[PDB]
Structures are given as C-alpha cells and as structure tokens.
Amino acid sequence: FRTFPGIPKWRKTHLTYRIVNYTPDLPKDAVDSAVEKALKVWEEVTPLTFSRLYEGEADIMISFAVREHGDFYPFDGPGNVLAHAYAPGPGINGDAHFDDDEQWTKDTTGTNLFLVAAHEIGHSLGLFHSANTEALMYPLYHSLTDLTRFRLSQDDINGIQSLYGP
C-alpha cells in the first residue's frame, strides 16, 4: 500500500493530471471529462487541488492505448474494465493506460473513461485497493459516478486524510 503522511511523493497539496493522449471515443472531450470529474471530488476530500497539466510533469499521467498492449489488466475491447495501471512513483509516475480498445461509452459504463481514471488516480497516490460499496475500490465499473460528491473509498479515504497532510 502507498499513501501517507504529509502525502506520497509530492511536496505540494496542489497537483495535476495529464491525459497524455485521450482516445477520441467518449469523445476525447468526454474522456477528459471522465477523468477531470474523478479528479474534482478527489480534491474535495484531500487538501489537494487537482487539475489538468499546469506544466512539466504531473501526479498521474495517462495515455490511452490498450487495444491490446499487455501491461497489467486485459485490453478487453469495448466493454469491461480497461485501465492497466500501476502505482505513483512506479511507472510514468502514476501510470495508467485506458483501453483505446473501447469506444468509451457510459452506457451504465460498457466502459467509461471515468473509472479507469478513478482507479488510476486513486491507485497512484494511495487510495489503492479495498472492498466497499461506493469506493474507487468498489470493484467493477457500475459505479457511483455521481462526481458532484462521488465520495471515494472510505478506507482509501483514510489515505486521502494523508494527502490532506496540511
């Protein structure tokens, strides 16, 4: 497990993400919105303030890809999960690859570029793996994607209470 205290591998409580690429299916624009939303309430919980790439490097950068790349999770094509992501520090710091195999969709999900985002974004920092109802860890895209107040994992939130160092 990652996270805490005084935050992960960042000396800022004002971070960023970067959709390196953005597969133009949701569209690219609604894929940015799938991510950017996820981000938004992750910044209500911790003291952090996430946003898209202010400059330089980021926290969790993401590229789309996995039509069948073969990293972690499965390139399963449109439908299923999709992110074959791995941790903050390890990978292009906070690395996640989202099935460009999909045709991003939010038809309940099918696949929506939003939870690959949540799973990734929460995965990197340290709100990484649990088992609840609403959590980023509630483990199969049919989520509580009401990202107005998504209310992340309550356990992996106890790690966002670290991000929250200040």
Ligand X SMILES: CC(C)C[C@H](CC(=O)NO)C(=O)N[C@@H](CC(C)C)C(=O)N[C@@H](Cc1ccccc1)C(N)=O
# chain residues binding ligand X, by CB under 6 A: 12
Q: CA angle, corner 112, sides to 48 and 133, nearest 5?
A: 65
Kindly name the residue from 36, 57, 68, 120 that is annotated as catalytic.
120
Shortest reach from residue 131's CB to ligand X, in Å: 10
User: Is 25 within any annotated ligand binding site?
Assistant: yes
CA distance 89 to 130: 20
Choose between 68 and 146: whose C-beta lies nearer to Ca ion: 68
Question: Is 134 noted as a catalytic residue in this protein?
Answer: no
Choose between 42 and 104: whose C-beta lies nearer to Ca ion: 104
Using the contact rule CB under 5 A, the part of the chain among 36-44, 62-70, 71-79, 116-124 near Ca ion is 71-79
Choose between 36 and 101: whose C-beta lies nearer to Zn ion: 101
- Residues 71-130, interacting with ligand X (CB under 6 A): 73-74, 76, 80-81, 109, 115, 119
CB-based contacts of 35: which residues, under 8 Å, 6+ apart? 17, 19, 62, 113, 114, 117, 121
Shortest reach from residue 80's CB to Zn ion, in Å: 14
Query: Could you say which of 76, 110, 134, 145 contacts Ca ion (CB under 5 A)?
Result: 76
Residue ranges of the alpha helices (H) in 2-126?
28-45, 113-125
SS3 62: strand
**Residues belonging to the chain:** 166
Residue 99 binding target from ligand X, Ca ion, Zn ion, none, CB below 5 to 8 Å by type: Ca ion
CA distance 133 to 140: 10
Task: Give the up-direction half-sphere exposure of residue 80: CA atoms within 13 A in the CB hemisphere.
Answer: 12
As annotated, the binding site for Ca(2+) includes 25, 59, 76-77, 79, 81, 91, 93, 95, 99-100, 102
Active site residues: 120
